[PDB]
Design a protein around this ligand. Structure first.
Ligand SMILES: CCCCCCCCCCCCCCCCCC(=O)OC[C@H](COP(=O)([O-])OCC[N+](C)(C)C)OC(=O)CCCCCCCCCCCCCCCCC
Ligand SMILES: CCCCCCCCCCCCCCCCCC(=O)OC[C@H](COP(=O)([O-])OCC[N+](C)(C)C)OC(=O)CCCCCCCCCCCCCCCCC
Ligand SMILES: CCCCCCCCCCCCCCCCCC(=O)OC[C@H](COP(=O)([O-])OCC[N+](C)(C)C)OC(=O)CCCCCCCCCCCCCCCCC
Ligand SMILES: CCCCCCCCCCCCCCCCCC(=O)OC[C@H](COP(=O)(O)OCCN)OC(=O)CCCCCCCCCCCCCCCCC
Ligand SMILES: CCCCCCCCCCCCCCCCCC(=O)OC[C@H](COP(=O)(O)OCCN)OC(=O)CCCCCCCCCCCCCCCCC
Ligand SMILES: CCCCCCCCCCCCCCCCCC(=O)OC[C@H](COP(=O)(O)OCCN)OC(=O)CCCCCCCCCCCCCCCCC
Ligand SMILES: CCCCCCCCCCCCCCCCCC(=O)OC[C@H](COP(=O)(O)OCCN)OC(=O)CCCCCCCCCCCCCCCCC
Ligand SMILES: CCCCCCCCCCCCCCCCCC(=O)OC[C@H](COP(=O)(O)OCCN)OC(=O)CCCCCCCCCCCCCCCCC
Ligand SMILES: CCCCCCCCCCCCCCCCCC(=O)OC[C@H](COP(=O)(O)OCCN)OC(=O)CCCCCCCCCCCCCCCCC
Ligand SMILES: CCCCCCCCCCC1=C(C)C(=O)C(OC)=C(OC)C1=O
Lengths: 169, 347, 48, 110, 98, 171, 314, 80, 105
């Protein structure tokens, strides 16, 4: 069962998505999204992407969901059947999908998926004296000149836009 | 709003459209789309009233949903092809998701519900910017991926857009909602002729852009947003009544005006591929667009509605608005049929 | 001080990398023989 | 492997300490209290200043995410291009800060 | 293909159906939208890392940056409508029916 | 499709260099200096053929040369090399700068016993040239025949016959 | 065997926190011309034990919380994130050797504000919520300068690994080439852990006014663990010690002395100056610290290129 | 132009220091003679294998052994 | 419209990312470099209509490298037959497949 760790983490990810997507309350949705983001970062880390998972923790959770919950605290003043119904039925489709995957080791819904453990797709070689994802990200200042330019311009324009529309005049 | 900040934001909108047009990478297409939408949001909220914020909220939600669907299609295509070159797609699911994302961005039916409300809630100049410039990039992306487009899906979207646009515009009295439903019908025509000859789509896009620009420019020149306020124009400037009469006749596709040429060439192209029922149905449906255009011309130019007393006070002053390019697009939208073979420059 | 110590560290890194470069042909040969043995054993058990 | 063992140990030690801190005076039977903020029932006033500083933090955090791979990126051969792109990114950070400064964005929470 | 791909597609579909059916609040719609982006992040990152596409490793960072700027714009719009009406309910954004 | 061909288990049989990583790292520079020719021949065969089954014999020769290198080390300089790889093996990152004294002792011993000189900086990272007798693989990717290209444009451009030929237009 | 390492990491943290309370009381007393506790034990050595037992037999407040879930969860997160920010610290060998330990620490520090947010929202008091929102805004606004300063300092290191930070300072201390970054980093870490002259929640409602005495003690213990951790991180960054690979006790004693001196400097700071206003510290950050941090970041990007002193990647 | 600098250095010294440091950082790497050393130090670091070339017969520059005189040299790095 | 500004101007704004078999930093190869190279050397210069039919086997090999459905299916069938034979009791696993091999290097 330890070879299925990424699969189990993906199950927790989709279960948290069902939980927060039922919309019980905006703050509880934010809490469920935080938990789901943590589990997804765990998936990425177990796949080998340390830098991208730590970006998820630093920017998505520590930097942006803070803003979401901060805005949620400035509205939605503090103190159902639908929420419980959709949570129950989403859990039902999820566990039915898991049972159909693991019983026959193959499934088709829109694409064809295989029920074996996901350690099979990994590469048998070593990367030498560097990590491949860090070199790929580090090539942004040497190769991605145009990407840097358009992203920075969009960020500055976003600052200008937010300052423009919240003024009220 | 600062003039310099307005200039920077408008060049950011055009920069996003250019980035979509010139790039060979799917991520750059996505980046250009978000840059364009983020920059165009403050143009909608120039006046700061609750209607503008409501329209901006609905526009933001629709464009964000369409953008997420587009990214989903791109990621599926990368998964099934291993590359990002903007060309034909290698998965029917990716093609369907991208086609519906571009349909949501264009506002074609049944994703049309945001267009009239958004056009109504924003000023005339921002509505002109939206309905004219915002549609250059999704049609370019559609122009790049036609080997992967499902024919049944795009033809269903086209006929649904034409019928829903005509039936929707039959009931409106506000000018911006009429322009929105007219836009929906014209995008139905454009994506109807897309898979047979995209040059006809480019020609229809250019002609619709010119006609819409002329009509919106006349609207802001006279500062009219309703039917009756437009009907007051005969007692202020009758030359504008003549101009709106000829432009609305040309918008209905009546020969020998320049609006006849797009549907004429579209019907010419569709019959070469042994499709006869659809061009007849689209012409019969475009008769409804002609109907509410003719109702507008009745209320404005061919009759004299009663005016009020203060029109004399308005007589004593001349206009000073910068009606930019208004005679040029007025001429180019009515007397361009003898230059029909000029469409070969677009191939 | 940082300039002198970082230049020395760069020289040490170059020495370490060139030691690895001298080593790794033998590791490449061993890895190739090992993966060929694994494939042969799996093929024989698949035949069984 | 060892990392998630340590994470589980820290989580279970924290939840053990919190459980003992909660439920130990629960075993006491002290009393029952009726108890019948300076504002009584006033609505929370919506302030644009706190939202503005939150959004400014978010945007600067995004440009920080862009700036993060500089120690790895300094090892490239194309040093002139990397230096120019790094200086351009931090210059855009400074320009956004200056635009917030001049248009009274940092006002009454300076 | 693999299994975690199926789970991430189903997570994206769940977040999409959550966004496409509003309950009461606009904030829940924004949360569903950002969960959709997070699922896109995980899917693209797993595909790029498994395919050993080195130069594509910069894409999820740009995706995160652009969609978080999108979310900042959406939060500003939500704050504006909350200042207008006193709450962020989606039933108060119905003036443009007429 | 086809049946993948694998060498028999007797063809993969060779006696191994059964030494640890720090033992390899201590004499790495001298191994690169002394046993360079069969290593570079094997690497050229590997990067050219793109198939380990075509480089099995070169790898076997690499093993033989490395084994003889370590036998020659053992004959004369067993004790200083043993101390050197011991103090290399103590370190967590296996640093070369924590064992300079024993390195100098081993280098001096092997210089006066075997005449070996360690390479300087950048020498082992050079690109060398290899004289081999095996022929170059003319088609190493096993690619099949490429599709024939379309015929291109030839001839001068002439005006259109009777213009556009679009309905009634005579131009 | 590894659980022994985990336990001997995490139990001395709590012991050092309790004796940090005692040391701060005694040092503030001797700095205010008086004595600290010296009656409960010999020189007050039994004061934390008595105070802990008293706080753990105190009556709970039993509030009318809006959500008991996050009311439980906020001290859980505070204590877990206080204890989990010690595992990549080299002492001189980290318990969990991380390739990206510095950025892992940044992620945990950025994640630490949810305890403040949930403690503010769980309490029914609106003034408590307002105080929590102000504290969260100050915390994230100083996260910004923490990130820029750490990024600019790391350009002399060459990687995000915390163990290489000892190797970099093998020649000279890193406070010599980066002392303005050291001063700004020290003030930013002082304002990061909500300490004087930035502890606005004690000046005129805290974010945990409705919390019981036990959970309040847990929050305060997490804050003190954060203080010790930040001072150890600052010592590793700027005041690196001599590490003999055969005698690790030399490095352990050296950085222990330096980090204790830095924490005593924290207590020395807290009893010298008046508190800031909210807008005054926002002015100090957005208009004083941030432009100089950006200028020094550009300087420390462009400097190792012009000096031919790029640190090695590995 | 001259009294403006004195006034702005008496009034906002933090911004003067920030702008001066920024100007130094942006004009000094184009002026220093050690940038080329950084370039050829970064490009002389051996990350991957130096794959040998098949000897056709005409390569006098390419060495047949690492200790051969021909080839790139790092004596400039050893001295500096 | 697809205005090829990059080819007209000679700039390279996004072609470096556009394929996986392109110039990658530190000469790092991808998992399916060879298959993608063969497919591109097919499809170049013949249009999409001819390349969708002429050497489709290169694209099938590329897709099999990318997603590996056939290899997964073959491994599933082999393991299923092994499980059936193990449960029915007519197959004994070898020592080297049970962790008692003492691997080569
Ligand atoms: C404002 C923009 C300022 C910076 C402009 C680019 C400066 C630069 O270093 O260009 C060379 C760099 C890199 O040149 P290079 O010669 O280092 O690159 C060699 C090729 N690769 C990438 C494979 C190593 O960029 C280019 O040559 C093309 C990309 C940028 C083109 C200009 C975009 C302007 C957009 C304006 C809106
Ligand atoms: C390690 C960190 C600190 C850990 C906690 C402190 C260490 C010591 C823990 C045990 C202390 C004694 C029990 C808890 C405190 C009880 C105080 C109290 O109010 O007692 C009266 C109470 C009630 O006594 P009562 O019946 O007279 O009630 C008085 C209140 N009226 C009349 C209003 C109802 O006693 C208890 O609740 C008994 C609790 C358990 C007693 C000890 C059992 C063994 C423990 C070993
Ligand atoms: C870790 C090592 C130890 C660190 C220090 C620990 C002990 C010292 C503790 C001090 C007291 C701490 C408590 C109070 C904290 C809050 C107050 C505070 O810090 O305010 C900061 C104050 C705030 O400034 P301010 O508010 O006074 O500024 C006035 C601004 N107006 C007019 C708009 C109101 O100063 C700074 O922010 C400066 C930061 C450090 C600057 C370093 C510059 C280095 C030199 C650059 C070059 C200069 C020459 C010119 C250019 C040459 C180019 C070649
Ligand atoms: C294959 C095709 C590829 C692409 C080919 C090229 C396509 C071109 C598309 C043009 C799109 C035009 C978009 C709308 C105008 C943009 C400029 C703008 O911002 O105008 C609005 C602006 C607002 O200013 P304000 O003063 O607030 O106005 C309110 C009234 N007082 O200012 C005003 O309101 C001033 C009043 C006059 C405005 C006149 C604008 C005319 C623009 C259209 C010209 C004709 C179309 C272009 C040429 C033909 C292209 C096919
Ligand atoms: C068929 C298309 C939908 C497929 C998913 C259906 C999930 C179960 C929904 C059952 C119906 C619940 C319902 O009435 O939802 C309406 C609700 C918005 O309405 P509200 O204002 O909350 O209350 C009025 C209730 N009539 O809207 C919601 O509560 C939306 C919640 C959606 C949750 C989806 C969870 C995942 C479902 C499985 C995967 C898809
Ligand atoms: C990493 C290191 C951490 C160290 C943490 C602790 C630091 C401080 C250590 C202790 C310092 C000295 C404390 C002395 C306490 C008083 C001892 C004493 O004499 O108590 C007498 C009292 C009454 O006695 P009685 O018999 O009534 O007298 C009549 C006779 N004429 O009798 C009583 O009160 C009853 C008996 C009390 C005995 C108390 C003994 C000390 C308890 C210390 C607790 C912590 C110990 C260390 C734990 C961590 C290390 C293992
Ligand atoms: C089954 C049998 C066991 C049952 C459970 C009991 C466990 C042991 C509990 C502690 C020992 C019991 C006796 C407690 C003290 C009683 C005697 C007393 O009152 O001594 C007073 C004396 C100081 O005299 P004082 O009145 O303060 O005079 C001031 C100076 N003029 O005081 C002193 O000199 C110091 C007294 C120190 C008391 C012991 C040390 C503290 C408690 C340590 C253990 C519990 C806490 C462990 C750590 C928890 C985490 C912080
Ligand atoms: C309200 C809910 C409860 C709240 C309290 C509890 C949760 C919050 C507090 C704890 C936070 C834990 C964060 C864990 C991830 C941190 C990043 C990380 O693991 O970095 C270390 C390392 C990457 O570094 P590197 O050196 O590259 O790896 C070794 C390379 N040779 O990576 C590795 O070594 C990878 C090891 C395998 C993968 C580990 C996956 C861990 C489990 C998933 C996440 C768990 C937390 C989920 C909840 C988040 C918050 C809600
Ligand atoms: C070109 C170099 C590189 C540039 C890019 C990198 C920049 C790094 C630093 C980023 C700083 C970002 C924020 C800048 C804000 C400047 C505008 C400003 O604050 O103006 C207002 C201020 C007067 O203050 P006040 O209006 O009262 O505001 C309340 C605070 N007292 O006004 C002032 O105090 C006057 C500020 C303007 C004049 C400053 C002159 C400094 C000259 C230093 C020596 C020359 C350095 C070389 C560069 C050329 C500079 C012109
Ligand atoms: C495992 C539990 C260990 C004991 C709990 C932490 C140590 C006790 C702290 C008590 C305390 C002391 C001494 C204290 O002096 C103090 O004043 C600043 C507090 O805050 C009001 C305290 O909470």
């Amino acid at each position: 069962m330890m070879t299925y760790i990424v699969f189990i983490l993906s199950i927790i990810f989709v279960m948290g998505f069902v939980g927060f997507s039922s919309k019980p309350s905006p703050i509880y949705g934010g809490l469920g999204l935080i938990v789901s983001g943590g589990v997804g970062c765990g998936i990425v880390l177990n796949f080998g992407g340390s830098f991208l998972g730590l970006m998820v923790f630093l920017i998505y959770l520590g930097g942006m969901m803070v803003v979401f919950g901060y805005t949620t605290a400035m509205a939605t003043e503090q103190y159902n059947k639908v929420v419980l119904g959709t949570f129950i039925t989403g859990l039902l489709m999820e566990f039915l999908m898991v049972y159909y995957v693991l019983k026959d080791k193959e499934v088709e819904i829109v694409f064809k998926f295989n029920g074996m453990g996901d350690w099979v797709i990994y590469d048998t070689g070593d990367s030498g004296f560097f990590s491949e994802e860090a070199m790929g990200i580090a090539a942004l200042y040497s190769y991605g000149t145009w990407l840097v330019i358009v992203t920075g311009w969009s960020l500055l324009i976003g600052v200008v836009v937010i300052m423009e529309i919240t003024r009220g005049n | 709003m600062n003039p310099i900040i307005l200039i920077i934001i408008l060049m950011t909108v055009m920069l996003g459209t250019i980035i979509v047009m010139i790039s060979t990478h799917w991520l750059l297409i996505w980046i250009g789309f978000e840059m364009n939408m983020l920059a165009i949001i403050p143009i909608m909220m120039k006046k700061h009233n609750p209607r503008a914020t409501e329209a901006s909220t609905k526009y933001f939600l629709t464009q964000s949903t369409a953008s997420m669907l587009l990214m989903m299609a791109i990621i599926i295509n990368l998964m099934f092809s291993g590359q990002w070159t903007v060309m034909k797609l290698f998965n029917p699911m990716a093609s369907m998701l991208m086609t519906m994302a571009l349909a949501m961005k264009l506002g074609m039916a049944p994703f049309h519900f945001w267009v009239p409300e958004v056009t109504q809630g924003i000023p005339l100049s921002s509505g002109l910017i939206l309905l004219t410039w915002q549609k250059l990039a999704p049609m370019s992306v559609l122009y790049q991926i036609l080997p992967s487009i499902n024919l049944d899906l795009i033809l269903t979207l086209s006929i649904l857009s034409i019928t829903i646009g005509g039936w929707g515009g039959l009931n409106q009295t506000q000018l911006r909602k009429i322009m929105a439903y007219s836009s929906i019908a014209h995008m139905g025509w454009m994506t109807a002729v897309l898979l047979y000859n995209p040059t006809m789509t480019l020609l229809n896009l250019i002609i619709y852009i010119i006609m819409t620009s002329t009509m919106f420019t006349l609207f802001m020149a006279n500062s009219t947003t309703t039917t009756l306020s437009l009907s007051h124009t005969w007692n202020k400037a009758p030359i504008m009544t003549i101009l709106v009469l000829i432009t609305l006749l040309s918008m209905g596709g009546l020969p020998p005006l320049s609006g006849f040429m797009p549907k004429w060439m579209i019907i010419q192209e569709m019959t070469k591929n042994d499709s006869i029922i659809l061009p007849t149905l689209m012409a019969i449906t475009a008769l409804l667009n002609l109907y509410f255009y003719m109702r507008l011309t009745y209320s404005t130019a061919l009759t004299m509605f009663p005016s009020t007393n203060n029109m004399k006070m308005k007589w004593q002053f001349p206009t000073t608005k910068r009606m930019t390019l208004l005679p040029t697009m007025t001429v180019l939208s009515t007397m361009l049929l003898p230059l029909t073979p000029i469409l070969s420059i677009l191939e | 001080s940082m300039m002198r110590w970082n230049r020395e560290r760069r020289r040490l890194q170059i020495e370490d990398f060139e030691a690895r470069i001298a080593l790794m042909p033998l590791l490449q040969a061993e890895k190739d023989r090992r993966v060929l043995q694994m494939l042969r054993e799996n093929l024989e058990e698949e035949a069984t | 492997m060892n990392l998630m063992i340590t994470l589980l140990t820290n989580f279970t030690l924290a939840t053990l300490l919190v459980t003992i801190a909660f439920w130990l005076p629960q075993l006491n039977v002290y009393s029952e209290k009726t108890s019948p903020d300076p504002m009584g029932s006033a609505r929370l006033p919506f302030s644009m200043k706190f939202f503005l500083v939150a959004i400014t933090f978010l945007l600067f955090d995004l440009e920080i995410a862009l700036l993060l791979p500089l120690p790895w990126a300094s090892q490239t051969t194309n040093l002139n291009t990397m230096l120019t792109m790094a200086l351009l990114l931090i210059f855009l950070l400074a320009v956004s800060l200056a635009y917030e400064w001049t248009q009274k964005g940092l006002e009454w929470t300076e | 293909m693999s299994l975690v791909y199926m789970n991430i597609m189903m997570a994206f579909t769940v977040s999409l159906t959550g966004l496409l059916m509003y309950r009461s609040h606009l904030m829940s719609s924004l949360l569903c939208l950002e969960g959709m982006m997070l699922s896109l992040f995980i899917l693209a990152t797993l595909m790029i890392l498994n395919s050993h596409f080195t130069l594509a490793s910069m894409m999820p960072i740009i995706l995160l940056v652009f969609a978080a700027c999108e979310a900042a714009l959406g939060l500003s719009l939500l704050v504006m409508v909350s200042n207008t009406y006193g709450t962020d309910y989606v039933q108060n954004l119905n003036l443009l029916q007429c | 499709p086809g049946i993948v061909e694998l060498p028999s288990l007797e063809d993969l049989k060779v006696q191994e260099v059964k030494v640890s990583s720090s033992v390899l790292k201590a004499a790495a520079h001298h191994y690169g200096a002394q046993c360079d020719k069969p290593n570079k021949e094997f690497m050229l065969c590997r990067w050219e053929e793109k198939d380990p089954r075509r480089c099995l014999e070169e790898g076997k020769l690499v093993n033989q040369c490395a084994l003889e290198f370590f036998r020659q080390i053992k004959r004369h300089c067993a004790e200083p090399f043993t101390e050197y790889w011991t103090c290399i093996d103590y370190s967590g990152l296996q640093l070369f700068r924590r064992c300079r004294k024993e390195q100098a002792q081993f280098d001096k011993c092997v210089l006066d016993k075997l005449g070996w000189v360690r390479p300087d900086l950048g020498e082992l990272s050079k690109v060398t040239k290899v004289k081999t007798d095996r022929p170059l693989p003319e088609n190493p990717y096993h690619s099949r025949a490429r599709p024939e290209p379309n015929p291109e444009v030839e001839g001068d451009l002439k005006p259109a016959r009777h213009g556009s030929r679009l309905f009634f237009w005579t131009m | 065997m590894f659980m022994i390492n985990v336990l001997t990491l995490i139990i001395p943290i709590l012991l050092a926190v309790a004796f940090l309370t005692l040391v701060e009381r005694k040092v503030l007393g001797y700095m205010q011309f008086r004595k600290g506790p010296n009656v409960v034990g010999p020189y007050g050595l039994l004061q934390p034990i008595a105070d802990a037992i008293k706080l753990f037999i105190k009556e709970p407040l039993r509030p009318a919380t809006s959500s008991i879930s996050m009311f439980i969860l906020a001290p859980i997160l505070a204590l877990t994130l206080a204890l989990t920010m010690w595992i990549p610290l080299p002492m001189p060998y980290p318990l969990i050797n991380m390739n990206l330990g510095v950025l892992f620490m940044l992620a945990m520090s950025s994640l630490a504000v949810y305890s403040i947010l949930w403690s503010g929202w769980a309490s029914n008091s609106k003034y408590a919520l307002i105080g929590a929102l102000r504290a969260v805004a100050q915390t994230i606004s100083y996260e910004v300068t923490l990130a820029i300063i750490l990024l600019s300092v790391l350009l002399m290191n060459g990687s995000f690994t915390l163990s290489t930070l000892i190797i970099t300072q093998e020649q000279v201390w890193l406070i010599f080439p980066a002392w303005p970054l050291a001063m700004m980093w020290f003030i930013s870490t002082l304002a990061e852990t909500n300490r004087a002259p930035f502890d606005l929640t004690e000046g005129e409602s805290g974010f945990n006014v409705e919390y019981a005495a036990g959970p309040f003690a847990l929050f305060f213990m997490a804050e003190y663990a954060n203080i010790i951790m930040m001072n150890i991180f600052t010592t590793t960054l700027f005041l690196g010690a001599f590490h003999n690979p055969y005698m690790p006790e030399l490095y352990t004693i050296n950085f222990t002395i330096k980090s204790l001196l830095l924490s005593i400097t924290f207590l020395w700071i807290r009893a010298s100056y008046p508190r800031f206003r909210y807008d005054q510290l926002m002015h100090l950050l957005w208009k004083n610290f941030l432009p100089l941090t950006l200028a020094l970041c550009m300087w420390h990007v462009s400097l190792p290129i012009l000096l031919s002193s790029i640190p090695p990647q590995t | 132009v001259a009294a403006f600098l004195k006034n702005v250095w008496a009034k906002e010294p933090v911004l003067v220091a920030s702008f001066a440091i920024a100007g130094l950082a942006v004009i000094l790497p184009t002026l220093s003679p050690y940038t080329k050393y950084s370039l050829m130090i970064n490009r002389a670091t051996p990350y991957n294998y130096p794959v040998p070339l098949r000897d056709d017969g005409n390569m006098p520059d390419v060495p047949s052994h690492p200790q051969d005189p021909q080839g790139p040299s790092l004596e400039w790095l050893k001295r500096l | 419209p697809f205005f090829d500004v990059q080819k007209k101007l000679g700039v390279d704004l996004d072609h470096w990312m556009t394929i996986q078999s392109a110039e990658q930093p530190h000469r790092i190869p991808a998992r399916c470099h060879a298959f993608e190279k063969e497919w591109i050397e097919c499809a170049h210069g013949i249009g999409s209509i001819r390349a969708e039919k002429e050497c489709k086997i290169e694209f099938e090999d590329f897709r099999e490298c990318l997603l590996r459905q056939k290899t997964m299916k073959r491994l599933n069938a082999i393991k299923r037959q092994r499980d059936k034979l193990i449960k029915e009791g007519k197959y004994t696993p070898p020592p080297h497949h049970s962790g008692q091999e003492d691997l080569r290097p």
